[PDB]
């Protein structure tokens, strides 16, 4: 609240300093921001405690940055950490005390939890509460009455208005409890699903699963893990532990196929007990319990086929012990979020690897599913070797004179097609691909503009893939990339970042970017995180190049796009010039070729 002569806020008169400040490695700002030291001997204990009570926002190598909020404190209480149980240790760890503001915030957030519980039974959602005064003073506004369908006091609530009531309670200061007591539940018989000994659970996966199952009752929340970290394995383990009917929701055909494959591989459950509620192919969804389907199908708004209508009615009628949702970052979308209310589930677990978006709808996930239970430390995984170390780099390509002339001259938005296609970046990508091809490194080129992708691919006679590409040709190209030594590069379009199971690649070049999309950036980066059989963290075997054009909007987009990666800790090294480019022969070495490319770009319209 107090501002120094500079931008930073003043806290000299706010909180004191502990005498043993050197011993205490923890800081506590009044706003809730906490700065932990990664060099302290008690760093591991401090990391565990701060991860338990707060969500990371920036975890560089030296000083980690966390911030705590109501959702994080509710998650702490869910895993069973009381207000004293957290605040006493926070004061002990803190080297400068705990401000009264944070003290009162923690007290209020902890006490305002568990008073209101939401439990669904016999397809009816009852808002139970041991304390009656909570309901007595919660029925002040008329929205609750119009919502409600027309000790331990409970009342039934309308299915459709659950989301509205929950978001209302979040700001009403009475969060709802979504804990599932699968251990004590006789209404829905347990499913015959077990985890085979073959599956191996990594320490971070076990920690995330523990945070989810803080107690005997499963907690509904979101667990963010890298795509290569085995989030599918974590979800399968969660379903197996729940031992009740599980509905997994993918985002595409590839996602549902991969989910079924993961289920069969890691769970002893028989093949016949798993169904694919997919329009392309179905396996009698009503027949078995464990189901894998898609947001599009479940939330489909237009006319429903007869068989799909029967399946949807069966799904609505039945109650699901677990609702797994992969790629939760798309949930807050209208149709996708409608699925949450369409289907009934005790706990809706969420898994993803890039929980970031521009529109401020990510905060809605906290109530749509639950608080962010776990968020894996990418740097720690890199050190442990679970994830391949990546030498993140941004190659700056000077824009050609003429191309810059038209780009600046035109105030329209042909620049997206223009700066994405310039001779300098073309030569840079050609030289980089040549260098990695002679180094036997697998290349996955990326480009949002299909026009630019096709031009580059024809000029380099490479197998570009894109949306309306035939499925058979797509599979053939992927198989050739994985097996045929003569080919070691594939030019994938935006379809690549959506969902796929691609072979591990040693390099990932990105000539063009869709925009300031942290989601796309992280999604494409996750492709090369696949750990090799015997690599090492310090070898930096994996490389990521994000080619950008100097003095163009692409620079702003790249800077706005690398925010999530830098927050994780990756250091994007800038490369102004590439050694050997002048000696190496590359296309567009004369003014004329650039001229024809510019003419084609202009005629593109």
């Amino acid at each position: 609240t107090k501002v120094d002569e500079y931008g930073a806020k003043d806290y000299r008169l706010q909180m004191p300093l502990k005498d043993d400040h050197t011993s205490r490695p923890l800081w506590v700002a009044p706003d809730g921001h906490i700065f932990l030291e990664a060099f302290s001997p008690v760093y591991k204990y401090a990391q565990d405690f701060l991860v338990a009570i707060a969500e990371p926002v920036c975890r560089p190598t030296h000083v980690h940055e966390y911030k705590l909020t109501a959702y994080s404190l509710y998650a702490a209480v869910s895993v069973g950490l009381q207000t004293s149980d957290i605040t006493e240790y926070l004061r002990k760890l803190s080297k400068t005390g705990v401000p009264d503001g944070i003290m009162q915030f923690i007290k209020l957030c902890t006490v305002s939890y568990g008073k209101v519980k939401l439990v669904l039974k016999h397809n009816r959602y009852f808002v139970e509460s041991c304390h009656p005064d909570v309901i007595q003073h919660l029925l002040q506004d008329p929205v609750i009455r119009e919502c409600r369908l027309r000790q331990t006091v409970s009342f039934e609530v309308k299915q459709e208005m659950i989301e509205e009531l929950q978001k209302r309670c979040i700001h009403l200061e009475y969060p709802l409890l979504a804990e599932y007591d699968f251990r004590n539940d006789s209404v829905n018989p347990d499913i015959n699903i077990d985890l085979k000994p073959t599956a191996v659970l990594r320490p971070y996966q076990e920690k995330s699963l523990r945070k989810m199952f803080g107690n005997g009752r499963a907690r509904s929340g979101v667990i963010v893990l890298p795509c290569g970290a085995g989030k599918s394995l974590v979800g399968v383990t969660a379903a197996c532990t729940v031992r009740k009917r599980c509905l997994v929701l993918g985002n595409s055909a590839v996602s549902v196929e991969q989910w079924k494959a993961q289920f069969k591989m890691w769970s002893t459950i028989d093949d016949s007990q798993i169904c694919r509620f997919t329009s392309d192919a179905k396996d009698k969804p009503i027949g078995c319990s464990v189901a894998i389907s898609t947001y599009s199908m479940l939330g489909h708004t237009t006319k429903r086929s007869w068989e799909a209508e029967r399946v949807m009615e069966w799904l609505k009628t039945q109650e699901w012990g677990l609702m797994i949702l992969d790629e939760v970052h798309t949930i807050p979308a209208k149709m996708f979020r409608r699925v949450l209310t369409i289907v009934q589930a005790h706990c809706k677990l969420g898994l993803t690897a890039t929980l970031v978006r521009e529109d401020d709808k990510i905060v809605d996930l906290n109530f749509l599913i639950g608080p962010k239970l776990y968020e894996a430390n990418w740097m720690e995984l890199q050190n442990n070797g679970y994830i391949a170390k990546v030498q993140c780099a941004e190659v700056w390509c000077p824009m050609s004179p003429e191309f810059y002339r038209e780009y600046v001259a035109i105030k329209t938005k042909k620049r997206i097609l223009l700066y994405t296609m310039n001779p300098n970046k073309f030569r840079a990508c050609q030289f980089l691909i040549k260098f990695h091809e002679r180094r036997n490194d697998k290349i996955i080129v990326f480009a949002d503009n299909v026009f630019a992708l096709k031009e580059y691919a024809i000029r380099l006679n490479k197998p570009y893939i894109y949306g309306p590409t035939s499925q058979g040709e797509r599979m053939q190209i992927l198989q050739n990339f994985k097996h045929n030594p003569k080919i070691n590069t594939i030019f994938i379009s935006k379809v690549g970042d959506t969902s796929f199971d691609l072979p591990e690649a040693n390099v990932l070049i990105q000539i063009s970017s869709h925009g300031g999309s942290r989601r796309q950036e992280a999604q494409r980066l996750g492709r090369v995180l696949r750990a090799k059989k015997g690599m090492v963290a310090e070898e930096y075997n994996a490389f990521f190049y994000s080619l950008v054009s100097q003095d163009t909007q692409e620079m702003a987009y790249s800077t706005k796009r690398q925010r999530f990666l830098v927050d994780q800790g990756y250091s994007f090294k800038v490369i102004t010039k590439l050694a050997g480019m002048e000696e190496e022969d590359l296309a567009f070495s004369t003014k004329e070729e650039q001229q024809q490319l510019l003419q084609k770009v202009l005629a593109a319209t």
């Binding site: 591991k44 204990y45 565990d48 069973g80 076990e206 699963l209 523990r210 989810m212 199952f213 532990t241």
Partner: peptide, 18 residues
């Protein structure tokens, strides 16, 4: 037959005392 996760949170910091 329950799993280790159902037991409870590890509470890794509880070991340290001052």
């Amino acid at each position: 037959r329950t799993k280790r996760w159902e037991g409870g949170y590890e509470r890794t910091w509880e070991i340290l005392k001052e």
